[PDB]
Design a protein around this ligand. Structure first.
Ligand SMILES: [Cl-]
Ligand SMILES: [Cl-]
Ligand SMILES: [Cl-]
Ligand SMILES: [Cl-]
Lengths: 161, 161, 161, 163
């Protein structure tokens, strides 16, 4: 598969969250690469990664970070590719710091932000798929099948007891 | 015993909370039906459920959901029956997202909102009973007896340990 | 020993917090009575308790409640004795609901509010002692000795290693 | 041996479970420090004496950690002109939100340089104290730059989260 998504994160611990994005992309048969890129510990690598993403064929970036989360916004500052932000749960503030430091970008440089935590990692993969589905009919077919199946599963299990 | 209450929730995991509503209704001998209805995964079923509730004889709907909780508000948009919202505790924000997404309805479509979590599930049943008690003398007697025995149990155990 | 403090709480579970007030009062040799008084389940008892507290010789009331905590405020509405409020930690909102429902009394009826949780229960006892110490030299001496011992204990143990 | 340049203080013994990580970082940087329990609420007189003596003793930075209604950093900054760093200790009831606001929201006139809630802020208080000292002490500047260079290279050497 062509590698269409860069799935990046500030630290190894963030992988416990963003692995769920990767699992969802695998389920949809969408090619991706997963890489640790730290805004704070590898700032020059962040610039290289963002600068070269478009030329390497990436079309969507999913960036996860926690706390004072600067990785998604700084990548969006350095590439015009759409950047999705996953707020990682933080130990002290339950990802509220993560959420506000990702979603509240001032006008001019956007980051499309998903839910705090695992839900947001899964939804970042589903949202990247929706973006790619406008271009790639096989991805659109895969996404619609995913949504149809998830709908049918709830319909066929209506009783909580 | 007529089925007067529809007890609905977005997902199977919500039942861990809304089962306490069901237990309370069973204690008051009030007929209900419990069903999984997802605003996000079964939107068409949500609309059909709300459209048909009155014709099926339901008089109150108790709807529980967590996170960005859209189930109560969309049911209230689609039936004129009173809809009670139970904010389910969320893992990341402790049901604060659930609470605000249910209670803060703009003017025009109301949802009567109860406490976050189990306390709100129990109180949604007691509140549905209070609604029904204006019309059904047997339910008024059951609710008054419940409240009197609840009061006496505290009075009968005045000393802590 | 004369009973100078009424130590009241809305439910048995609150005693896990307010027992630390009782312990502190025991250490200061201040007489108190501890009782379950529920704003929501025994409202008539709350009114009788408040009405009779002054004639009974009580001088300070410590009231603990969690969630939508109405017990301290309604006692303060029904007796002119100083009422101290202890916000009990809540399962869903970590006592933030408890704190705001106690401290934010509108002008006209005050509740002297202490910290959320165990720290506030201990401090409610110490503050009640501070109130009584204006009257009772034995209590003033006990409180000053408590404060002197806790200061000297920290001074005598300056090294965290 | 090492002259003591940092006073590392905290309101209670339980705060040491957080500030020990500041001590560990200063040990790694070979910076002389002294750790002490100084309680704004239980030893107010000692707080004033500690702050009054700090400059003459040769301390150049104070790291102060406290939780809840955290008054230790601000009152030390009120009583010495040395730079005071504040570490908000995570509180059991409010997760250090009370700690954070009672430290960082100082009115104009008396500053406290505030770090992250909890262990991250304890580590960063040590690194920030090193940055302050590095302007004056080239040995500490070299230790701090080496710490940063090593932590950068370690991430660069481990790019794949799947191992
Ligand atoms: Cl770098
Ligand atoms: Cl559907
Ligand atoms: Cl009563
Ligand atoms: Cl002192």
């Amino acid at each position: 598969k062509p590698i269409l998504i860069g799935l990046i994160m500030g630290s190894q611990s963030d992988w416990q969250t963003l692995i769920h994005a990767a699992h969802t992309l695998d389920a949809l048969n969408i090619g991706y690469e997963a890489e640790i890129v730290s805004a704070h510990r590898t700032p020059d690598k962040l610039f290289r990664y963002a600068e070269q993403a478009e030329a390497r064929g990436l079309e969507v970036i999913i960036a996860g970070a926690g706390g004072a989360a600067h990785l998604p916004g700084m990548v969006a500052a350095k590439t015009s590719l759409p950047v999705l932000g996953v707020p990682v749960m933080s130990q002290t503030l339950n990802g509220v710091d993560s959420l506000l430091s990702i979603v509240q970008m001032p006008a001019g440089i956007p980051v499309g932000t998903l839910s705090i935590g695992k839900a947001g990692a899964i939804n970042s993969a589903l949202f990247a798929a929706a973006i790619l589905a406008n271009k790639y009919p096989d991805i659109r077919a895969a996404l619609k099948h995913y949504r149809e199946q998830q709908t049918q599963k709830v319909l066929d299990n209506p009783n909580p007891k």
